[PDB]
Design a protein around this ligand. Structure first.
Ligand SMILES: [Mg+2]
Ligand SMILES: [Mg+2]
Ligand SMILES: [Mg+2]
Ligand SMILES: [Zn+2]
Lengths: 192, 140, 66, 100, 221
């Protein structure tokens, strides 16, 4: 039997298209179909190991942040599963398809950096790697989550769900991740 | 509709040739189109037109904006192709064209303008009057 | 102007930037408007050989390193 | 301590040699002493080259974009500062036809 | 937009003289007649700087030869032009300039039987024979005296070939490779020369064209 994520979500329904991501987003593999997002993996011992880590575990990793929340994983596994439930309640399709969709759809491509060449110092137009694209995607999504949920009544599960949906929808109003993405890509276009 | 006071009779085969005098200084850039004579001036754009900062006058961003304005304006004069005559301040001054040189040349063709023959005319003393520097040049 | 091309890395060439935060890379295009064209690009982030890259201009080509 | 035997200028068998203004500053420098490099570059970044060569009206061009010819003459302070020439050890100091 | 600044402008097609293609090359702009200003007459003295984009068959390789034309006549919305000058691109010059050889230059003043006074500048370079790559070691210089004899000879020959020809003839010969061949043949005794060139031509004194000669200049096949 093919494990479903949390038991209710089928991985077989997730198919990645854009050829950059297929090697960079976990869920395709027998090794990445997990009931529970918690591997206790060694994903950081070598340069690209992070790739072989399940995407939802990755997200959970990003969630665990700020001094008070550091190293509480159970909390974030809860938050994620809940947010996923709210997601299936809103869209009605695999909360994974929405997540993966929204990791793909929101993150920078162009970014600007200082490249010193002899006398030239000024920003320059630079392209973003697949791994960084993904990493940034998640970083952003969750940062928006925190900023919003901070003093509000909306919980993290809720904020995060809101964000994931808007993030796939491309909404530049409702999605912080896409706010920053577009802002960055614009800074970049202007710096060529 | 569109009354283009440019040339009466054209075709899709035809080439309409304007001439672009481009001046690049360390302090500015000039994109200037005329007819083959040089007498009747069609379009005029300087970097300083395109930016409010005295220092940005020369820069590629400025040269680009300048260029696209020129192109947009030739387009309605029905002009496919410019010859290019490139110039630095020259004479006794520097003969290296400024930063805007390349950028403007590119942005011109980038804008879907055909490009004809290219020459560098920079003023070239057989011999010179004496340079604006000191005997010792610019110190610092 | 939104027009986009997929770009796959053949070779990792140099390492560059003031802080040294960027990678120089050789690229073959897959768009289908321009196929098998090669380019040299500066990429921020960590890259292997044979990644794919989303490229907004196939005209901007990065100055090679010496 | 005579540093150079040349004393820096290529001039012998004459009293006087014409003075040239430095490209960079404009300081008068001896034509023998001057660091002079002839430069044939192209007016345009290789990328920019692609862009233009697309749009060239006359297809009868084979390398039909002109090169930029510069005769570049540097006073010493300038050509040192600007790295055209740089400090070398005593032994190498006399090496005459070096590049690639 | 309010009142496009070119509202008053008439266009004219340039027509090239007898050595060149009858087909128009470029077009020019002029302001409409004001009742004082006569449209055709504002253009009497204008000067056209072109390549040979002007000889249909032979053009494509010579981007190196600049030709100045001046408008002698307006006929029916298209402007006829007579010979004005000859010249060279920066490229085709600094192309030819090499260290370790002698740069010869020769200036001449001549009259046509057509009634023109012309000034021709000639350029020539020392040709290495010895079969090595010309260098600091491979010095090619020709003695200053040889240079002088070379001037005298070139110059003489040109003045001769000038006095016997019309300006149509002279210009046709001048643009093309004929004179280079002949000049090498004269010069070779004194010294072998490489890439002989006519650097520039100026027209000092030009007579006005009768309707007849301006018709005979037009004469296109
Ligand atoms: Mg000064
Ligand atoms: Mg003395
Ligand atoms: Mg010898
Ligand atoms: Zn200096």
């Amino acid at each position: 039997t093919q494990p479903k994520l949390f038991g209710k979500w089928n991985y077989d329904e997730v198919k990645i298209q854009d050829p950059c991501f297929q090697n960079y987003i976990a869920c395709t593999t027998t090794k990445s179909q997990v009931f529970v997002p918690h591997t206790a993996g060694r994903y950081q011992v070598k340069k690209f190991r992070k790739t072989q880590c399940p995407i939802v575990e990755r997200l959970i990793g990003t969630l665990m942040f700020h001094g008070r929340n550091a190293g509480k994983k159970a909390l974030c596994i809860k938050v994620v599963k809940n947010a996923f439930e709210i997601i299936h309640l809103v869209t009605g399709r695999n909360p994974l398809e929405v997540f993966v969709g929204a990791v793909q759809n929101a993150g920078p491509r162009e970014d600007s950096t200082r490249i010193g060449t002899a006398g030239v110092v000024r920003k320059q137009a630079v392209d973003v790697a697949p791994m960084r694209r993904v990493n940034l995607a998640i970083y952003f999504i969750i940062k928006g989550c925190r900023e919003s949920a901070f003093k509000s009544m909306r919980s993290i599960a809720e904020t995060l769900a809101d964000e994931i949906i808007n993030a796939e929808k491309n909404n530049t109003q409702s999605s912080w991740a896409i706010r920053k993405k577009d802002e960055i890509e614009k800074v970049a276009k202007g710096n060529r | 509709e569109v009354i283009s006071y440019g040339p009466p009779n054209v075709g899709a085969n035809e080439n309409v040739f304007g001439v672009c005098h481009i001046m690049a200084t360390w302090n500015d850039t000039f994109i200037h189109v005329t007819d083959l004579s040089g007498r009747e001036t069609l379009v005029r754009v300087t970097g300083g037109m395109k930016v409010k900062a005295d220092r940005e006058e020369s820069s590629p961003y400025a040269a680009m904006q300048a260029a696209i304005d020129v192109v947009n304006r030739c387009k309605e004069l029905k002009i496919n192709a410019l010859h290019i005559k490139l110039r630095a301040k020259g004479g006794v001054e520097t003969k290296q064209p400024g930063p805007g040189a390349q950028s403007a040349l590119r942005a011109l063709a980038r804008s879907g303008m055909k490009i004809g023959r290219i020459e560098d005319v920079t003023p070239i003393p057989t011999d010179s009057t004496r340079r604006e520097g000191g005997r010792r040049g610019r110190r610092l | 102007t939104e027009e986009t091309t997929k770009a796959r890395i053949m070779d990792v060439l140099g390492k560059t930037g003031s802080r040294g935060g960027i990678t120089q890379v050789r690229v073959v295009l897959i768009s289908g408007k321009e196929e098998g064209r090669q380019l040299i690009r500066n990429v921020k982030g960590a890259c292997r050989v044979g990644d794919v890259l989303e490229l907004m201009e196939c005209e901007r080509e990065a100055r090679r390193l010496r | 301590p005579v540093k150079r035997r040349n004393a820096g200028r290529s001039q012998k068998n004459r009293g006087h040699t014409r003075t040239v203004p430095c490209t960079n500053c404009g300081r008068q420098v001896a034509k023998d002493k001057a660091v002079k490099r002839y430069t044939v570059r192209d007016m345009v970044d290789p990328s920019s080259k692609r862009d233009i060569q697309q749009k060239l009206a006359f297809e009868n061009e084979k390398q039909g974009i002109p090169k930029l010819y510069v005769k570049l003459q540097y006073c010493i302070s300038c050509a040192i500062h600007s790295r055209v020439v740089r400090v070398r050890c005593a032994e190498d100091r006399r090496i005459r036809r070096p590049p690639i | 937009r309010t009142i496009d600044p070119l509202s008053r402008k008439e266009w004219y097609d340039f027509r090239a003289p007898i050595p060149f293609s009858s087909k128009s090359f470029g077009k020019t702009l002029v302001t409409k007649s004001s009742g004082n200003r006569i449209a055709s007459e504002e253009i009497k003295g204008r000067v056209v700087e072109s390549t040979l984009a002007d000889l249909k068959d032979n053009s494509n390789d010579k981007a190196w030869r600049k030709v100045k034309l001046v408008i002698d006549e307006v006929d029916g919305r298209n402007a006829k032009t007579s010979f004005y000058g000859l010249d060279i691109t920066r490229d085709r010059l600094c192309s030819m300039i090499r260290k370790w050889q002698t740069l010869i230059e020769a200036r001449v003043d001549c009259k046509t039987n057509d009634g023109y006074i012309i000034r021709v500048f000639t350029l020539a370079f020392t040709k290495k024979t010895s079969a090595g790559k010309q260098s600091s070691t491979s010095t090619c210089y020709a003695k200053s005296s040889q240079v002088r004899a070379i001037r005298r000879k070139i110059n003489t020959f040109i003045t001769n070939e000038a006095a016997k020809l019309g300006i149509a003839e002279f210009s046709k010969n001048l643009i093309g490779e004929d004179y280079t061949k002949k000049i090498e043949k004269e010069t070779k005794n004194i010294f072998p020369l490489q890439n002989i060139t006519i650097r520039k031509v100026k027209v000092l004194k030009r007579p006005k064209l009768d309707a007849t000669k301006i018709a005979e200049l037009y004469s296109h096949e």
